[PDB]
With several copies, the nearest count.
Chain A
Amino acid sequence: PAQDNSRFVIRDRNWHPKALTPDYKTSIARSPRQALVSIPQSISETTGPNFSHLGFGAHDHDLLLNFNNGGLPIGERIIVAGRVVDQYGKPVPNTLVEMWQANAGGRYRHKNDRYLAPLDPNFGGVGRCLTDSDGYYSFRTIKPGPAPWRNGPNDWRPAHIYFGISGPSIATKLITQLYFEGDPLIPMCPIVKSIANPEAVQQLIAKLDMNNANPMDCLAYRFDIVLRGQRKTHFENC
């Protein structure tokens, strides 16, 4: 079974977005008004699932082929790749990275999305993989289009891909969103701006990565992820 042998650097909750960020309107009623209660790390918090033996399908990481209904999806072919490390710079190998997104037109394949831009019959918008033994992941996909949404009267998400990362424990688990280098919608978005520190926002912007592109085929973006630093216990109960 799992053991309590490590501690995770405490989160900076002014680096993360705060709960109440009223320009993102849905946060107003979905933010706790009482303070979080701090608790010490125990085996409950410092362990978590390892997904080494989850069974992945051949195309689970390849959104150009994993919703194949007779053709390729329309839109900008891209690789999205990066490394997962902790705050001490240590790679996080064999960790679960899940992602989801809209199609090239900003339309999601979910019944609740009634945006008039059409669905793509060959695009589903869901991927997963494990990081390799050196902490690297890679997906192939279509660059998603900006998505309008009912926040302010003319609000549009920048092009974005949702990411979920498990890491070594439930204390490291994170959901975040990737944005794309240069997107002029980034500075305007109330969800991006839930993050108060502009340097933190920059950490979510994937960079064009020509080095990793396939010529005459697909471009590439690089998105590195940093999870909470993990250290050994020291001088406890003594």
Chain B
Amino acid sequence: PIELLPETPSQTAGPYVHIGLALEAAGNPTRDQEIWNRLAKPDAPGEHILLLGQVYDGNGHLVRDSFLEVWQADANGEYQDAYNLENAFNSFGRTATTFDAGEWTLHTVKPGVVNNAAGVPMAPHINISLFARGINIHLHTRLYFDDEAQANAKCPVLNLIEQPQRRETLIAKRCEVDGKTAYRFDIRIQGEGETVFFDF
């Protein structure tokens, strides 16, 4: 058969990932421009939301060295790839769990609806890639919203998860943090309540 050049193989991001990719989180000096956890400035259109979560291993213990990358549509359902710290909104961001701060946070807007390749609407979601010591190739997941039950039930991606009880692992829980709208999205890498991870 036709065999292309093989992809460079993945390796773990290791325990010191923050020194390269989360400098402030590493407690190290930062450069003038950093890619971090504020996707939306106050002026961005849409519903401003705080996202937060903890990451657990197969023994139910906190993962205190996680690094997360996120990719989401703006409030109008458009992906914005022109990354610039001057933008009121960026579709991409980074966050981390650390020894001092075991709960990651993101400051963003709720993403608008995006159609899949067949033209079928997907429920509002944030794409997440999870890296850490012990993770040899990053884990892909999606964060959906518990206040989008109708859309979630019809999402062509959620519906590829064979068991309804596993779909529930991808649904973030709405709360309020200091009077502001928030959602908690905890990830369980292994075992009871294991978070659905995707391949694509």
Count residues on chain A whose CB falls below 8 Å from chain B CBs.
Answer: 102
Stretch at the interface among B41-49, B101-109, B176-184, B188-196: B188-196
* CA of A200 to CA of B136, assembled, Å: 14
Kindly state the separation between the CA atoms of A164 and B117 in the bound complex, as whole angstroms: 28
Q: Are the C-beta atoms of B81 and A50 separated by less than 8 Å?
A: yes
CB proximity to A under 8 Å, residues B1-45: 1-2, 4-21, 23, 26-28, 31-33, 35
A177's nearest neighbour on chain B, judged by CB, is B11
Give B136-180 as 1s and 0s: 1 = Cβ < 8 Å from A's Cβ atoms. Answer: 111110000000000000000100110000100000000000000
Judge whether B20 and A16 touch: CB under 8 Å: no
Instruction: Give Cα A130–Cα B14 distance, bound, in whole angstroms.
Output: 23
Q: Is the interface of B mostly helix, strand, loop or mixed?
A: loop
Specify which chain B residues have a CB less than 8 angstroms from the CB of A171 in the assembled complex. Answer: 200
B9 to chain A, nearest CB (A): 5
Q: Which residues of chain B are within 8 angstroms of A100 by Cβ–Cβ distance?
A: 16-17, 19-21
Which residues does chain A contribute within 8 Å of B138, judged by CB atoms? 173, 175
Task: Tell me if A17 and B9 are in contact (CB < 8 A).
Answer: yes
A234 CB–B CB distance under 8 Å: no
Residues A195 and B9 in contact, CB atoms below 8 Å apart:
yes
Asked if A232 lies at the interface with its beta carbon under 8 angstroms from chain B, I say no
CB contacts (< 8 Å) of B58 on chain A: these are: 28-31, 33
* Residue ID in chain A nearest B100 by CB atoms: A111
We find that the number of chain B residues with CB closer than 8 angstroms to chain A is 84
Tell me the nearest residue of chain A to B65, going by C-beta: A112
Cβ of A60 within 8 Å of any chain B Cβ, yes or no, is yes
A4 to B118, CA, bound (A): 11
Q: Within 8 Å of chain A (Cβ to Cβ): is B88?
A: no
Are A150 and B5 interface neighbours, CB within 8 A?
no
What 1/0 flags go to A130-168 for Cβ under 8 Å of B?
000000000000000000001011000000001010000
CB of B19 within 8 A of CB of A109, answer yes
Query: In the assembled complex, how far is the CB of residue A120 from the closest CB belonging to chain B, in whole angstroms?
Result: 14
Asked whether B127 lies within 8 Å of A45 as measured between CB atoms, the reply is yes
Question: In this complex, what residue of A is CB-closest to B136?
Answer: A17
Most buried by B among A19, A26, A53: A26
- A236 engages B117 (CB within 8 Å): yes
Among A40, A51, A204, contact of B8 (Cβ-Cβ < 8 Å): A204
16 contacts between A and B (CB under 8 A): A29-B58, A31-B135, A32-B189, A42-B157, A47-B81, A57-B32, A102-B16, A109-B19, A109-B28, A164-B21, A174-B8, A175-B10, A176-B9, A177-B14, A188-B1, A228-B7
- A residues near B, CB below 8 A? 1-2, 4, 9-13, 15-19, 21, 24, 26-34, 36-45, 47-57, 60, 85-89, 98-100, 102, 108-113, 124-126, 150, 152-153, 162, 164, 170-171, 173-177, 181, 184, 188, 191, 194-195, 199-201, 203-204, 207-212, 222, 225-229, 233, 236-237
Nearest first, the 5 closest Cβ-Cβ pairs linking A and B are A100-B20, A26-B134, A30-B134, A49-B92, A87-B4
Q: Which residues of B contact A (CB under 8 A)?
A: 1-2, 4-21, 23, 26-28, 31-33, 35, 57-59, 61, 63, 65, 69, 71, 73-74, 78-85, 90-92, 99, 114-119, 122, 125, 127, 129, 131-140, 157, 160-161, 166, 189-191, 194-200
